[PDB]
Amino acid sequence: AKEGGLNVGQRNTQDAMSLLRTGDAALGSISNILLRMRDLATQAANGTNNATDTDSLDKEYVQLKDEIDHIAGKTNFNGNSFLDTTATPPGKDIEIQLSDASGDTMTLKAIDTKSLTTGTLTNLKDRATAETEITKLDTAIQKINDERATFGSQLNRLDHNLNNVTSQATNMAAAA
């Protein structure tokens, strides 16, 4: 159901929780790919690879970059590609009205996953480039960890709202 355009009620909250689980799992896949990319970059920066091995590491690394972009574009809730605000059509925020909470609204914010990950990365075409990729990969791993933390926290918050669960944090926030 809606109330002045805004989405309300238990089933709507469940839908949003489903979007959050989808987003977290997709960002989890992206994080695991970034870890594999970090391993490849570390190997390639090492100094010790010939022409063929340099090429094979670079090929796999670039394939993994493309896989991140694929996941970023394909992930959706009901056709909304919320991990890619640069898509056509762009991912958009999802608004969720909380129940018995004085009209509080949660926004699942759509993000630019590519900008946080592949937009900052290049390739392993040479040893020197591979070395500088490592730092960039560590940065991207941390950014993705924050984005997943956001979705995880929002999921907990919706779970408490939908399931009428009160915790220490609820009791603390009651006065405000």
Numbering used by the authors: 54 to 229
What does the article say, verbatim?
Among these diverse flagellar proteins, flagellin is a major component of the flagellum that forms the flagellar filament. In the flagellin filament, the D0 and D1 domains mediate inter-molecular and inter-domain interactions and form the helical stem of the filament. In addition to the native function in bacteria as a structural unit of the flagellar filament, flagellin stimulates innate immunity in the host by directly interacting with Toll-like receptor 5 (TLR5), an innate immune receptor. In this study, Bacillus cereus flagellin (BcFlg) was identified as the smallest flagellin consisting only of the D0 and D1 domains that still activated innate immunity as a TLR5 agonist.
To provide a schematic plan for insertional fusion sites, the crystal structure of BcFlg protein was determined at 1.85 Å resolution. The structure contains BcFlg residues 54–229 corresponding to the D1 domain, which was shown to directly interact with TLR5 in a previously reported SdFlg-zfTLR5 structure. The BcFlg structure presents a topology of S1 (residues 54–56) - S2 (residues 59–61) - H1 (residues 63–98) - H2 (residues 104–127) - S3 (residues 147–150) - S4 (residues 158–161) - H3 (residues 166–169) - H3a (residues 171–173) - H4 (residues 180–216) - H5 (residues 221–226). The H1, H2, H4, and H5 helices are α-helices, and the H3 and H3a helices adopt 310 helical structures. BcFlg is structurally similar to its orthologs (PaFlg, SsFlg, SdFlg, and StFlg) in that it contains a three-helix bundle structure (H1, H2, and H4) appended to an S3-S4 β-hairpin. In contrast to the common fold, the BcFlg structure is distinguishable from other flagellin structures in forming unique conformations at the N-terminal and C-terminal regions. BcFlg residues 54–61 that correspond to the N-terminal region of the D1 domain fold into two β-strands, S1 and S2, and their connecting loop. In contrast, in the BcFlg structure, the C-terminal helix in the D1 domain is split into two α-helices, H4 and H5, which are distanced by 11.3 Å and angled by 72.9°. In the SdFlg-zfTLR5 complex structure, the C-terminal region of SdFlg D1 is also discontinued to two α-helices as for the BcFlg structure but with a different distance (16.9 Å) and angle (13.8°). These observations suggest that the C-terminal region of the D1 domain is a pliable helix that can bend and adopt diverse conformations. Because the residues 181–185 form an α helix, an insertional site was selected in BcFlg residues 178–180 (middle fusion, mF) so as not to interrupt the secondary structural fold.
